[PDB]
């Protein structure tokens, strides 16, 4: 057995995957088999979700997280997010579940049967971690693959049916995107926006033309950078800046994945465009706004003058001003005045919420939507009791947004921890002190005392 | 070679679980306190003492089961099985909360038995008795909270019940009734506990990251041998690291390890003193100067004043069900509530 | 050498009494900015309208507080997650009214404390140490990010961040329990196990090492003079300590490897505090602790109360009373 015990490999059983650092064939098998696990879960979960899926309930009432992703891509849904065809969800699950067997077979093959290292079998497939030019070549292949993957989303949106547009005129509907936003002052303008409130960085993207046009820019950037990395070698400043080792490249990815995990947590929590509320439930801000609207509507129907009602503090009970003068809902939801949603935007004028439209133009579909969203706020217990912590058992509800945000915060955090673990270790291992201080040349004993 | 010396020989035999003379006290008392707790939480209700279900048999889970305290009407009765309340009836003894006093009293004598074990083993192997001395703190906590606190109060009913959520109720009771977070003795406790966990984390991490390379493996645990005379990690490097990061550092390993005894032990002792005060309702409930000012100036608001309102909510909303011997009927119009909620 | 090469050698110098480093060039201005502003705000800041309801809370010493009640009050609910630096205010008096100092302090603090973690990596690298003290520090760091940043983000306002004061901390805790049932959340419970266990293990390790100190001193002097700084010999008999503690419990319960023992002392409170931080940071998105309110029902359908039901009454009392003038509608949604 080659490198399969601690004495030969230097790593204990619980650090057992580190025995694969220089065994590229077994390491390839680890990765392909793990890719099979990911594809298996995507397949097995979708089929689980579909087997449980009641078509007459909203998706967010059903503890589904994958079916909403498919519905957002345009498959299976009609106007307002209602499900018209369960069969695309079945196909996505099945095809993932079958492809996981192929990835699983090739992972297991290279892990246990095939050559332990690839460097003798092939010069193209073998690699040294220290071979900087080979590393950029594999990086370049993978960038081209990811860039085509972004263009697939563009292909679906433009030439294969469209995407679910929650902002479409007349209600949410699957809409083909014909004019994506190509202009880089808009696309790269999102990158320069503040992440703070009212701004939201890239999380505030609020139309599918910007989403699609960004993915055009990303696909071409990734293909161009892919080609660039196949044709160049890391410049001198890059070679002096980085650690060039397998553990170091892993650490760099862990830093990147953690950052992406944190961004996804915010995307699912705040964005109702690529995470439509008809599939994922209302956002936290959306439900709080929906409550103020609901009681505005009820109280106005009873005869209340809503623009002139004082709350207990003296601020307007239903309506007040934001710190820049826009007319906004009152109460605690004053914090969420930057919320924008297709059920609320028809009440907004130039100065914010228009009081004449509020008096005259609230439709019954908005009243139903506000009540539905207020009663499906992303608040629930770990045993899936919906509502505040003080609520009784009855409602079985935790919003997908809560499940998705909490999970991805947890994952992003530990991946930050992993980045710090592996980045520190790769630094120490490259400098040669990862196993401890050498008793003969202890560095601190050669230093002058601090005092 | 009398019978005492032969019995001493047998009690101190090298075996898998050392017994000792302390084991005569410890082992039955610990087993009964442990077994009484599992028995009560599996099968015993709190319906007649608290009006609660508290067992797996009634549908509770691990978070909600408890062996609950006896009824307030029992006062501080020992509630012996043969006592005048149960009169030898085991079923009634369980219904009246006799398992609570059973666990508390056998837990108390077991804890004594455990500290006696610490002394006995330290004396036999020839080490100093600092582990027993450090165990005085959990004993001081147990005695103050489980015995002295209810003895100062009206009955054993107000002691903590032996259960996860029951303890959580005890925590929220102490906020709402005692304002225990405001108590400087509790604060000293918090500092000792959090300071203790900090020292645990930092000392462990410092040793692991200043290790000498004593072997070839990248997993470094194999490079230690318990018969080595040499330090396994560099105190000098650790000292230089911490002096440059934080300004100060340990330079004496003995003082370092004593300070690690001292910090959590002192904190727990300080909290115990606070709980003794709370036995007599001698709370640090309020700051008199702020109350005078808040009473006369309806615009003066602080985080302390806000907490007092929270405390008033806790008392009013919890007391009818938390103290069912009082027969509190608090009509809905007397309950303090803010606007809307 | 040019000026840049001389400056870089000064910055990364191991001979500086306090290590600067590249993280230090961020850490030092940020932490000084946060400290100075905190001290001035804690002493002298005027009352802050935390709840956005024109009901200012007095947090500073000059405005009637003592050490225990004083705080730097969180920024106004009307601001929400909006970035409120000094230049965004029309005057300092408006910045003060709206709780500007809080945003300035926590932002400089979190940036500074993140660089403290990096600086710990940096020095360990310069000294030839292993690099993972910083990983241990990531536990309290994550906890600080949880209460100052992540919780406000998920709740939609820096007004829900923990106040910078002692009673303000308690207010944050009580309201948190009211709204999230944190005591019934297993991540908090792991946090408690992390900190009680950490204090336990701190006491245990301290006591066992102290018990096994080898005699080098007389009765008239502190036994701590038995150790000399940088001596090569072990100052305690770990075989004696293992022989005690393995007879206190049983032999295989006790560490005989000091490296394993010290790893455990690292890993236990650190992993526990990570779970605590993730607890807060996941309750930021309102995934709350276990709700067993009315879980136990008799044959007729009568609710049979449990201890969780008693907790709920206490939770209700905090909930109905907290921010007593801020709510206009029946549900507390963020």
């Amino acid at each position: 057995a080659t490198n399969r015990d601690q004495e030969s490999s230097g790593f204990a059983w619980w650090a057992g995957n580190a025995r694969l650092i220089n065994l590229s064939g077994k390491l390839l098998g680890a990765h392909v088999a793990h890719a099979g696990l990911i594809v298996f879960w995507a397949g097995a979960m979708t089929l689980f979700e579909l087997a449980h899926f009641i078509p007459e309930k909203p998706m967010y009432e059903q503890g589904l997280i994958l079916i909403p992703h498919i519905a957002t891509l345009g498959w299976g849904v009609g106007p307002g997010g209602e499900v018209v065809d369960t069969f695309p969800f079945f196909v996505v699950g099945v095809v993932h579940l079958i492809s996981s067997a192929v990835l699983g077979f090739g992972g297991v093959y290279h892990a246990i049967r095939g050559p332990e290292t690839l460097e003798e079998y092939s010069s193209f497939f073998g690699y040294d971690w220290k071979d900087k030019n080979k590393m950029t070549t594999i990086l370049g292949f993978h960038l081209i693959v990811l860039g085509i993957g972004a263009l697939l989303l563009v292909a679906k949106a433009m030439f294969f049916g469209g995407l679910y547009d929650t902002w479409a005129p007349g209600g949410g509907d699957v809409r083909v995107i014909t004019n994506p936003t190509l202009d880089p002052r808009v696309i790269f303008g999102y990158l320069l926006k503040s992440p703070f409130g009212g701004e939201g960085w890239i999380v505030s993207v609020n139309n599918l033309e910007d989403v699609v046009g960004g993915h055009i820019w990303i696909g071409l950037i990734c293909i161009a950078g892919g080609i660039w990395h196949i044709l160049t070698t890391p410049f001198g400043w890059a070679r002096r800046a980085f650690i060039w080792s397998g553990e170091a490249y892993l650490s760099y990815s862990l830093g990147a994945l953690s950052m992406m995990g944190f961004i996804a947590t915010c995307f699912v929590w705040f964005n109702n465009t690529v995470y439509p509320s008809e599939f994922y439930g209302p956002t936290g801000p959306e439900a709080s706004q929906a409550q103020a609207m609901t009681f505005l509507i009820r109280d106005q129907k009873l005869g209340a003058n809503v623009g002139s009602a004082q709350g207990p503090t003296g601020l307007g009970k239903y309506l007040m001003r934001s710190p820049t003068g826009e007319i906004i809902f009152g109460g605690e939801t004053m914090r969420f005045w930057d919320f924008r949603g297709p059920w609320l935007e028809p009440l907004r004028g130039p100065n914010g919420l228009d009081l004449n439209k509020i008096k005259n133009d609230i439709q019954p579909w908005q009243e139903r939507r506000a009540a539905e969203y207020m009663t499906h706020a992303p608040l629930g217990s770990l045993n899936s009791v919906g509502g505040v912590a003080t609520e009784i058992n009855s409602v079985n509800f935790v919003s997908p947004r809560s499940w998705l945000a909490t999970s991805h915060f947890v994952l992003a955090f530990f991946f930050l921890v992993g980045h710090l673990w592996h980045a520190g270790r790769a630094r120490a291992a490259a400098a040669g002190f990862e196993k401890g201080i050498d008793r003969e040349s202890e560095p601190v004993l050669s230093m002058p005392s601090l005092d | 070679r009398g019978w005492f010396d032969i019995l001493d020989d047998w009690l101190k035999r090298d075996r898998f679980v050392f017994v000792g003379w302390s084991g005569i006290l410890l082992f039955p008392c610990a087993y009964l306190a442990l077994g009484g707790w599992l028995t009560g939480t599996t099968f015993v209700t709190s319906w007649y003492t608290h009006g609660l279900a508290s067992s797996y048999l009634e549908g509770c889970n691990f978070l909600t089961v408890a062996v609950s305290t006896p009824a307030n009407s029992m006062g501080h009765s020992l509630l012996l099985l043969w006592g005048p309340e149960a009169q030898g009836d085991f079923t009634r003894w369980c219904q009246l909360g006799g398992l609570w006093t059973f666990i508390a009293l056998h837990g108390a004598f077991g804890l004594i038995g455990f500290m006696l074990r610490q002394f006995e083993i330290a004396r036999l192997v020839g080490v100093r008795p600092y582990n027993a001395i450090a165990f005085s703190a959990p004993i001081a906590v147990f005695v103050s909270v489980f015995l002295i606190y209810p003895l100062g109060q009206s009955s054993w009913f107000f002691a903590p019940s032996f259960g996860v959520a029951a303890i959580f109720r005890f925590l929220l009771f102490f906020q709402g009734f005692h304002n225990w977070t405001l108590n400087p003795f509790h604060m000293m406790g918090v500092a000792g506990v959090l300071g203790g966990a900090l020292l645990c984390a930092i000392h462990g991490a410092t040793v692991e990251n200043t290790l000498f390379q004593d072997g070839e493996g990248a997993s470094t645990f194999r490079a230690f041998n318990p018969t080595q005379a040499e330090e396994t990690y560099s105190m000098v490097t650790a000292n230089r690291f911490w002096s440059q990061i934080f300004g100060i550092a340990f330079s004496n390993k003995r003082w370092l390890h004593f300070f690690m005894l001292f910090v959590p032990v002192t904190g727990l002792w300080m909290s115990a003193i606070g709980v003794v005060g709370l036995a007599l309702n001698l709370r640090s409930y309020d700051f008199i100067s702020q109350e005078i000012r808040a009473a006369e100036d309806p615009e003066f608001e602080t985080f302390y004043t806000k907490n007092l309102l929270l405390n008033e909510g806790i008392r009013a909303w919890m007391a009818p069900q938390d103290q069912p011997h009082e027969n509190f009927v608090f009509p809905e119009e007397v309950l303090p509530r803010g606007n809307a909620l | 050498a040019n000026l840049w090469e001389r400056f870089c050698n000064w910055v990364t110098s191991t001979d500086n009494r306090l290590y600067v480093g590249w993280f230090g060039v961020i850490m030092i201005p940020t932490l000084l900015a946060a400290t100075i502003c905190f001290v001035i705000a804690f002493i002298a800041a005027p009352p802050v309208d935390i709840d956005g309801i024109r009901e200012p809370v007095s947090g500073s010493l000059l405005y009637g507080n003592n050490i225990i009640t004083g705080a730097v009050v969180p920024s106004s609910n009307a601001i929400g997650l909006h970035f409120y630096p000094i230049w965004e205010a029309a005057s300092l008096d408006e910045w003060l009214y709206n709780g500007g100092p809080y945003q300035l302090i926590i932002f400089h603090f979190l940036l500074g404390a993140s660089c403290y973690m990096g600086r710990q990596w940096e020095l360990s690298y310069r000294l030839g140490m292993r690099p993972w003290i910083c990983v241990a520090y990531s536990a309290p760091l994550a906890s600080a990010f949880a209460v100052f940043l992540i919780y406000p983000i998920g709740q939609g306002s820096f007004s829900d961040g923990m106040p910078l004061g002692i009673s303000g901390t308690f207010n944050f805790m009580i309201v948190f329990q009211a709204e999230h049932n944190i005591l019934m959340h297993p991540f908090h419970q792991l946090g408690v196990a992390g900190v009680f266990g950490g204090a336990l293990f701190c006491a245990m390790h301290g006591s066992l090492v102290t018990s096994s100190l080898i005699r080098e001193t007389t009765e008239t002097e502190s036994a701590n003079y038995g150790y000399k700084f940088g001596q090569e010999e072990e100052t305690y008999n770990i075989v004696a300590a293992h022989g005690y503690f393995g007879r206190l419990i049983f032999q295989y319960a006790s560490f005989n490897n000091s490296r394993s023992l010290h790893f455990f002392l690292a890993a236990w409170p650190v992993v526990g505090v990570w779970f605590a931080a993730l607890g807060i940071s996941t309750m930021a998105f309102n995934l709350n602790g276990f709700n067993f309110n009315h879980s136990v029902i008799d044959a007729k359908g009568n609710v049979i109360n449990t201890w969780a039901d008693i907790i709920n009454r206490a939770n209700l009392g905090m909930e109905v009373m907290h921010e007593r003038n801020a709510h206009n509608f029946p549900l507390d949604l963020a």
């Binding site: 004993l445 005392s449 601090l450 005092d451 | 000098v236 000292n239 002096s243 300004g247 100060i248 550092a249 330079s251 | 009494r17 306090l18 002493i43 010493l61 000059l62 003592n66 050490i67 000399k228 700084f229 940088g230 001596q231």
Partner: peptide, 30 residues
């Protein structure tokens, strides 16, 4: 008086930090 007392004790603590860092007994290797 209260405010002065709290600030005074605080200022002494900061001073004690200064002496504990810059005027410690120097760790000497022996």
């Amino acid at each position: 008086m209260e405010t002065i007392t709290y600030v005074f004790i605080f200022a002494c603590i900061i001073a004690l930090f200064f002496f504990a860092i810059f005027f410690r007994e120097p760790p000497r290797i022996t």
